[PDB]
Design a protein around this motif. Structure first.
Motif, PDB file in Angstrom:
ATOM      1  N   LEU A   1       0.829  -1.193   0.000  1.00  0.00           N
ATOM      2  CA  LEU A   1       0.000   0.000   0.000  1.00  0.00           C
ATOM      3  C   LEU A   1       0.867   1.248   0.000  1.00  0.00           C
ATOM      4  CD1 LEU A   1      -2.640  -1.150   2.614  1.00  0.00           C
ATOM      5  CD2 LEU A   1      -2.853  -1.103   0.122  1.00  0.00           C
ATOM      6  N   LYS A   2       0.479   2.222  -0.810  1.00  0.00           N
ATOM      7  CA  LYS A   2       1.142   3.512  -0.887  1.00  0.00           C
ATOM      8  C   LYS A   2       0.125   4.625  -0.657  1.00  0.00           C
ATOM      9  CE  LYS A   2       4.642   1.919  -4.170  1.00  0.00           C
ATOM     10  NZ  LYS A   2       5.416   2.327  -5.380  1.00  0.00           N
ATOM     11  N   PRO A   3       0.581   5.791  -0.198  1.00  0.00           N
ATOM     12  CA  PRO A   3      -0.366   6.848   0.188  1.00  0.00           C
ATOM     13  C   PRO A   3      -1.208   7.309  -0.989  1.00  0.00           C
ATOM     14  CG  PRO A   3       1.840   7.318   1.002  1.00  0.00           C
ATOM     15  CD  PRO A   3       1.974   6.211   0.010  1.00  0.00           C
ATOM     16  N   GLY A   4      -2.491   7.524  -0.725  1.00  0.00           N
ATOM     17  CA  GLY A   4      -3.406   7.959  -1.752  1.00  0.00           C
ATOM     18  C   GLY A   4      -4.114   6.852  -2.498  1.00  0.00           C
ATOM     19  N   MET A   5      -3.775   5.588  -2.248  1.00  0.00           N
ATOM     20  CA  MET A   5      -4.420   4.500  -2.969  1.00  0.00           C
ATOM     21  C   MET A   5      -5.832   4.292  -2.448  1.00  0.00           C
ATOM     22  SD  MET A   5      -1.430   1.627  -3.496  1.00  0.00           S
ATOM     23  CE  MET A   5      -0.246   1.856  -4.821  1.00  0.00           C
ATOM     24  N   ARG A   6      -6.686   3.768  -3.322  1.00  0.00           N
ATOM     25  CA  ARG A   6      -8.067   3.432  -3.005  1.00  0.00           C
ATOM     26  C   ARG A   6      -8.180   1.919  -3.011  1.00  0.00           C
ATOM     27  NH1 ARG A   6     -12.800   4.267  -6.675  1.00  0.00           N
ATOM     28  NH2 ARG A   6     -14.441   4.346  -5.080  1.00  0.00           N
ATOM     29  N   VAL A   7      -8.695   1.358  -1.920  1.00  0.00           N
ATOM     30  CA  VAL A   7      -8.746  -0.082  -1.707  1.00  0.00           C
ATOM     31  C   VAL A   7     -10.200  -0.505  -1.565  1.00  0.00           C
ATOM     32  CG1 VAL A   7      -7.976  -1.998  -0.259  1.00  0.00           C
ATOM     33  CG2 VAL A   7      -6.547   0.038  -0.525  1.00  0.00           C
ATOM     34  N   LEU A   8     -10.569  -1.570  -2.268  1.00  0.00           N
ATOM     35  CA  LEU A   8     -11.868  -2.208  -2.113  1.00  0.00           C
ATOM     36  C   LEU A   8     -11.743  -3.462  -1.247  1.00  0.00           C
ATOM     37  CD1 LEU A   8     -14.857  -2.705  -2.839  1.00  0.00           C
ATOM     38  CD2 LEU A   8     -14.029  -3.909  -4.860  1.00  0.00           C
ATOM     39  N   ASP A   9     -12.594  -3.563  -0.230  1.00  0.00           N
ATOM     40  CA  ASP A   9     -12.670  -4.731   0.649  1.00  0.00           C
ATOM     41  C   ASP A   9     -14.009  -5.413   0.401  1.00  0.00           C
ATOM     42  OD1 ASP A   9     -12.887  -6.654   2.612  1.00  0.00           O
ATOM     43  OD2 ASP A   9     -12.536  -5.304   4.303  1.00  0.00           O
ATOM     44  N   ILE A  10     -13.976  -6.526  -0.330  1.00  0.00           N
ATOM     45  CA  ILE A  10     -15.187  -7.284  -0.629  1.00  0.00           C
ATOM     46  C   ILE A  10     -15.481  -8.213   0.537  1.00  0.00           C
ATOM     47  CG2 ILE A  10     -16.328  -8.843  -2.232  1.00  0.00           C
ATOM     48  CD1 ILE A  10     -14.385  -7.790  -4.356  1.00  0.00           C
ATOM     49  N   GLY A  11     -16.611  -7.973   1.204  1.00  0.00           N
ATOM     50  CA  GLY A  11     -16.986  -8.716   2.394  1.00  0.00           C
ATOM     51  C   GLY A  11     -16.365  -8.136   3.646  1.00  0.00           C
ATOM     52  N   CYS A  12     -16.649  -6.862   3.928  1.00  0.00           N
ATOM     53  CA  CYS A  12     -15.898  -6.138   4.947  1.00  0.00           C
ATOM     54  C   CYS A  12     -16.328  -6.464   6.373  1.00  0.00           C
ATOM     55  CB  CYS A  12     -16.023  -4.638   4.702  1.00  0.00           C
ATOM     56  SG  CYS A  12     -17.684  -4.007   4.959  1.00  0.00           S
ATOM     57  N   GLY A  13     -17.481  -7.099   6.563  1.00  0.00           N
ATOM     58  CA  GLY A  13     -17.917  -7.451   7.912  1.00  0.00           C
ATOM     59  C   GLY A  13     -18.109  -6.225   8.792  1.00  0.00           C
ATOM     60  N   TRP A  14     -17.564  -6.282  10.006  1.00  0.00           N
ATOM     61  CA  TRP A  14     -17.645  -5.178  10.958  1.00  0.00           C
ATOM     62  C   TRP A  14     -16.581  -4.103  10.733  1.00  0.00           C
ATOM     63  CZ3 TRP A  14     -17.681 -10.360  12.839  1.00  0.00           C
ATOM     64  CH2 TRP A  14     -18.934 -10.816  13.275  1.00  0.00           C
ATOM     65  N   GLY A  15     -15.813  -4.173   9.645  1.00  0.00           N
ATOM     66  CA  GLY A  15     -14.910  -3.099   9.270  1.00  0.00           C
ATOM     67  C   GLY A  15     -13.561  -3.088   9.948  1.00  0.00           C
ATOM     68  N   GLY A  16     -13.184  -4.168  10.631  1.00  0.00           N
ATOM     69  CA  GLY A  16     -11.878  -4.214  11.268  1.00  0.00           C
ATOM     70  C   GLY A  16     -10.730  -4.026  10.296  1.00  0.00           C
ATOM     71  N   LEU A  17     -10.827  -4.629   9.106  1.00  0.00           N
ATOM     72  CA  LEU A  17      -9.716  -4.530   8.162  1.00  0.00           C
ATOM     73  C   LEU A  17      -9.641  -3.135   7.559  1.00  0.00           C
ATOM     74  CD1 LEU A  17      -7.370  -5.566   6.470  1.00  0.00           C
ATOM     75  CD2 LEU A  17      -8.974  -6.711   4.970  1.00  0.00           C
ATOM     76  N   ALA A  18     -10.788  -2.571   7.163  1.00  0.00           N
ATOM     77  CA  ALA A  18     -10.803  -1.188   6.701  1.00  0.00           C
ATOM     78  C   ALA A  18     -10.272  -0.267   7.785  1.00  0.00           C
ATOM     79  CB  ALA A  18     -12.216  -0.780   6.303  1.00  0.00           C
ATOM     80  N   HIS A  19     -10.763  -0.445   9.011  1.00  0.00           N
ATOM     81  CA  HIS A  19     -10.267   0.311  10.151  1.00  0.00           C
ATOM     82  C   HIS A  19      -8.749   0.212  10.230  1.00  0.00           C
ATOM     83  CE1 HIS A  19     -10.635   1.089  14.798  1.00  0.00           C
ATOM     84  NE2 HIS A  19     -10.188   2.143  14.136  1.00  0.00           N
ATOM     85  N   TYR A  20      -8.231  -1.019  10.296  1.00  0.00           N
ATOM     86  CA  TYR A  20      -6.792  -1.208  10.457  1.00  0.00           C
ATOM     87  C   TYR A  20      -6.007  -0.538   9.337  1.00  0.00           C
ATOM     88  CZ  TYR A  20      -2.278  -3.319  11.278  1.00  0.00           C
ATOM     89  OH  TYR A  20      -0.922  -3.509  11.474  1.00  0.00           O
ATOM     90  N   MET A  21      -6.476  -0.654   8.097  1.00  0.00           N
ATOM     91  CA  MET A  21      -5.613  -0.210   7.009  1.00  0.00           C
ATOM     92  C   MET A  21      -5.728   1.287   6.761  1.00  0.00           C
ATOM     93  SD  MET A  21      -6.401  -1.358   3.138  1.00  0.00           S
ATOM     94  CE  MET A  21      -6.833  -3.027   3.545  1.00  0.00           C
ATOM     95  N   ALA A  22      -6.929   1.861   6.911  1.00  0.00           N
ATOM     96  CA  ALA A  22      -7.049   3.312   6.839  1.00  0.00           C
ATOM     97  C   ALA A  22      -6.268   3.976   7.967  1.00  0.00           C
ATOM     98  CB  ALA A  22      -8.521   3.727   6.855  1.00  0.00           C
ATOM     99  N   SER A  23      -6.306   3.398   9.170  1.00  0.00           N
ATOM    100  CA  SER A  23      -5.601   4.012  10.292  1.00  0.00           C
ATOM    101  C   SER A  23      -4.093   3.980  10.089  1.00  0.00           C
ATOM    102  CB  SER A  23      -5.940   3.304  11.599  1.00  0.00           C
ATOM    103  OG  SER A  23      -7.330   3.240  11.791  1.00  0.00           O
ATOM    104  N   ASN A  24      -3.567   2.888   9.533  1.00  0.00           N
ATOM    105  CA  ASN A  24      -2.128   2.672   9.525  1.00  0.00           C
ATOM    106  C   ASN A  24      -1.456   3.002   8.203  1.00  0.00           C
ATOM    107  OD1 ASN A  24      -1.400   1.542  12.219  1.00  0.00           O
ATOM    108  ND2 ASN A  24      -3.042   0.128  11.657  1.00  0.00           N
TER     109      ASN A  24
END
Ligand SMILES: CCCCCCCC/C=C\CCCCCCCC(=O)O[C@H](COC(=O)CCCCCCCCCCC)COP(=O)(O)OCCN
Ligand SMILES: CCCCCCCC/C=C\CCCCCCCC(=O)O[C@H](COC(=O)CCCCCCCCCCC)COP(=O)(O)OCCN
Lengths: 348, 348
Positions: free
Chosen positions: A131-154
């Protein structure tokens, strides 16, 4: 009688004694058990457990031994042939799962507890995606959003999460407030966008093999030319209808596990296979961790569930743990691209 | 004429100028080139190069651009359809290859020269195999014995190498004198033994897909129950007869590249797929390293070969390098077991 003799003979090949005292031995309270299990297979074994017809101190060890010995196959033929022809709430998950609510395999290579193991798994996903800054990521089947949370935060990325549960959407939005995260409630097959990266955890098992071609076509449509796609899924060592009757009835009605061959064949026209990681043995450790935490939490949730539910959920967690320990089922992370110049050194 | 216009139009899509001065541009000395290449495809391109009909300063860049743009596919249909229907000595290899005589992909993750890159590749093979003292290892397709040499010297194991070349047998025996290495000259399909580990480098590409099932059956027969098998092979991104006409005529007459799907389908009944590593981009670096060393060595061997051989060998090395750089063909190391308890953390 013959039912008892057959069952005793099969179980002895796995090192399991009927009415013994070893951890993986079984104690039988209703003698109709032997006939029921031989006639009804996986469903009779699990339903008879739920009915209180037998007990076992370490069901995870029982299932590991049973599956290592391949007793589902050593069964007499006229039994196998007959067989072939043939809810959970946030009070439970918030206590059983880790702070990122990962209802998926953790990575125990360097962690000694569930929470650290899930962070290592989340970090590994992010590092494999490069991952590099400014990229847009799609999470298919995101559930409660832990992965989106983790990756947007970090990482300095935008995330679009897609889910089918209106409840999970809301909890995911709440979890990710303040981050560049959008949670969509829709069918992934309707997506027509362009993402730098795509990730999918624990929804491919519900797609069904008849729809694998469509799945990879949808990912291809939504992935930018130099993009990278990570697929995370439980896997079967065999190409067929990989559906366990008991799991299908009580846990995952749409679940069917892919084989390597099926993923390879469906993804071939779309992507180069860049890396294939198997850490199925870690799912054994993950499931036993959840089981431990489920037990500790049981006093606080008992009223919202039943004792039959407890037995069902205990059987589910421990049988699956044994199936992973026996290396019967697998856990894969597959990295795909269209052939990025200079290749990928995919993280471990 | 139409031949020139068609060829010029295809090449411009790849950024290649006819009679230009850029490194990947081509200079055409015989105007029959355009017709010959469009009618005869890969064979006409390479044979016309050998015939001196054209020149190019960086054939590796030419082929990388041509293949990235997919010109073999953008060709007009009536050309493609017509096409679909349709030696090396130790003086050369000892100078071109590294001290371990590895005529196979090296691993450049942390190396900056061919010799170090081949040792890293050899070490990685040994570490993926998780070798322990006293183990017996089978090397199917041992060549000149560099891998047996490396692993017997560095790990306390016995090695059985199998080759088809009586010359390679002798050089391998000489190389491994003083080590617990046996080099057999026979057909691998006749092996009926039991090894702790099996490794195969650069012979699967000559097995042919009709014989993949037999190949994995032979490996299974010869692998001890808890054993581990490492397969190292060049790979195609597509499931078909993956045979390039020019390579087939001049370099590898029995060569046919497997796809992931073919390996998956043939290995499925025998083994769990534990890990799949793709470092195809490193083969580009390997091939260019060999090309450099081939050129330096040319004065010392010119008399035993011809100028036409030099052109052929130059085309071979650079076209293959470009095909790997374009990510058209792959380099795989696949680790297989029958499902070892606790899984494998496969080295990188
Ligand atoms: C389809 C799954 C959908 C999963 C969706 C994943 C979403 C991610 C979130 C949570 C998942 C956590 C748990 C994952 C469990 C995986 C499902 C599973 O167990 O798969 C079953 C095996 O069942 C078993 O382990 C049961 C044991 C077998 C019982 C046989 C006993 C009968 C013989 C005994 C005779 C004496 C089918 O496996 P096959 O390849 O057919 O073998
Ligand atoms: C079958 C191989 C057997 C290998 C045995 C491995 C033993 C290990 C030892 C040494 C190997 C080192 C070199 C490996 C080269 C791999 C062979 C190879 O190049 O494969 C060819 C591609 O050819 C090419 O790269 C040629 C370029 C294509 C030319 C197309 C031009 C025509 C269109 C232009 C129109 C203007 C077939 O690839 P496909 O999947 O069919 O695509």
């Amino acid at each position: 009688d013959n039912w008892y003799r057959i069952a005793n003979e099969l179980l002895s090949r796995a090192g399991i004694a009927i009415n013994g005292s070893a951890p993986a031995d079984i104690r039988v309270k209703n003698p109709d058990f032997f006939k029921r299990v031989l006639q009804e297979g996986s469903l009779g074994l699990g339903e008879s457990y739920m009915d209180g017809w037998w007990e076992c101190d370490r069901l995870d060890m029982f299932f590991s031994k049973v599956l290592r010995a391949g007793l589902e196959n050593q069964l007499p033929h006229h039994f196998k042939d007959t067989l072939r022809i043939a809810d959970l709430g946030n009070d439970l998950f918030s206590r059983m799962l880790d702070p990122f609510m990962q209802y998926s395999c953790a990575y125990w290579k360097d962690a000694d507890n569930l929470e650290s193991a899930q962070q290592a798994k989340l970090k590994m996903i992010c590092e494999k995606l490069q991952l590099k800054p400014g990229m847009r990521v799609l999470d298919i089947g995101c559930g409660w959003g832990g992965l989106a949370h983790y990756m947007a935060s970090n990482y300095d990325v935008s995330v679009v999460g897609v889910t089918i549960s209106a409840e999970q959407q809301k909890m995911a939005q709440e979890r990710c407030e303040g981050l560049d995260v959008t949670i969509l409630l829709q069918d992934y097959r309707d997506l027509n966008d362009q993402f730098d990266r795509i990730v999918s955890v624990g929804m491919f098992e519900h797609v069904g093999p008849k729809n694998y071609d469509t799945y990879f076509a949808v990912v291809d449509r939504n992935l930018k030319p130099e993009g990278i796609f990570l697929l995370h899924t439980i896997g079967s060592k065999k190409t067929d209808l990989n559906v366990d009757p008991w799991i299908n009835k009580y846990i995952f009605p749409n679940g069917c596990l892919p084989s390597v061959r099926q993923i390879a064949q469906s993804s071939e026209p779309h992507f180069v296979m860049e890396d294939w990681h198997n850490f199925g043995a870690d799912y054994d450790t993950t499931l036993m961790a959840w089981y431990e935490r489920f037990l500790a939490a049981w006093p606080e949730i008992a009223d919202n569930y039943s004792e039959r539910f407890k037995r069902m959920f205990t059987y589910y967690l421990n049988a699956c743990a044994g199936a992973f320990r026996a290396r019967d089922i697998q856990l894969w992370q597959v990295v795909f691209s269209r052939g990025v110049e200079n290749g990928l050194r995919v993280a471990r």
